[PDB]
Amino acid sequence: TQVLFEHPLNEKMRTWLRIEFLIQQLTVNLPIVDHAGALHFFRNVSELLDVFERGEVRTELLKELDRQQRKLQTWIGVPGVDQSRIEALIQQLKAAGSVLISAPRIGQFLREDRLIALVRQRLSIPGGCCSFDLPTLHIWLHLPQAQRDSQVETWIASLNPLTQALTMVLDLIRQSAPFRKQTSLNGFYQDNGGDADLLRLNLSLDSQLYPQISGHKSRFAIRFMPLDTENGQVPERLDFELACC
Template sequence: MSDINTMILVEHPLNEKMRTWLRIEYLLQQLLYEKNFKNIASALTFFRAASDLIDILERFEIRGDLLKKLEHQQQKLSNWLCAPNTDKDLIDSLIIKLADCTNALISASRIQDHLKENRLIISVRQRLSIVGGCCSFDLPALHLWLHLPDEDQTQYIDHIIQTLKPLHHGLMMILDFVRQSSSLEMVNSLNGFFKGNTEKGELLRLGIPLKHRVYPKISGHKNRYVIHFIPLEPEQSRSVDDFSFELACC
């Protein structure tokens, strides 16, 4: 059972690019952690994530945007080398990691092509939009694959994940820099509302005490935002008492 004193971390993007990056991160997490297929449900989580990832990579110029951000971050770190009292060894190591991510992304072919050329992914992808369309008689190839030895399944999944490593490493480097650009600070909500201003903000991070049983509905963009806390239980009063929560605008 969850500790009632637990802080729930919630993230909300303040621009479309960050929104897309967070969705890719979410899908990559499913691909990376749904590797032990105990049943059809866990397998479909993996293949649905792969299908959704194809859609995003087809619609947006992800690699180009990541390369620009990686280059910008390298330049920013290089400028910090001239500042006094900086940890030059740490900065040099980060610049090297960013350069490695950049080179890996440049060298990688169109990432979605590896997924689109996978016959099993495509066969599942074609059935996902059909209600109940992933039964064993609809997808006999998947039904057979689920009965293969574990080592065969692992080899298959590891190959897919290997093709996604340049995307995964580059994206995580960027998101780590964004998340670490601002620390969580305690602020107060008033009647379940909080308003804030920011300059070129990309990501809001909230630490919300579980005991209040509220979730945030956030609207905003890079200059200003509004947070409205809503009770989880419908029988609760629509108004929310004042309470403190943690907030970082990155």
């Protein structure tokens, strides 16, 4: 009966969350059988390439992978903790890293693909991607299903070195911190984030509201606002759980 809100506390976590989201959307509506499925797929690809054009994700994500290995290394001597399970986890990190750096250009396969590039151009036009403006797509959707599935696989698997490394670090961020109980007065809250990239906030579906998070330096502030901007309102004592990961 709870709703989890994730909020990035730096431009790093923003990009990673956007990329994580865009990548998993590719594999959500498979297989591609119709226009809807195709346009959903290609647009997610198109939006992925646009994010990639903004800089090099490779360099940041590789620094983050190394960062996590050093943290796990701090836990070796601790009583009770098991060695061969984190060192295997460390070994998976170095593997995800070595593959990422040795990987080709990111999104280049998708960038160079004739059909995808031909759809990418027509996406910026509201009614652009119809059958008469994309006969090439229209004829592609009449092909045997097995031919499309093979193309889709090669397209998604080209993002495998990135997908791996990224999934690794986000899975290790979301496990680094526990949910601490906090309370808000009149729908307001603030704290010093510190050295965290991600806030994880559990509310309540029945609580009738959502968090609006702002930031300054390494500090954050939450103003809980009612989903209904008119019919419903914050209490003066709102209990919630928040993790600083």
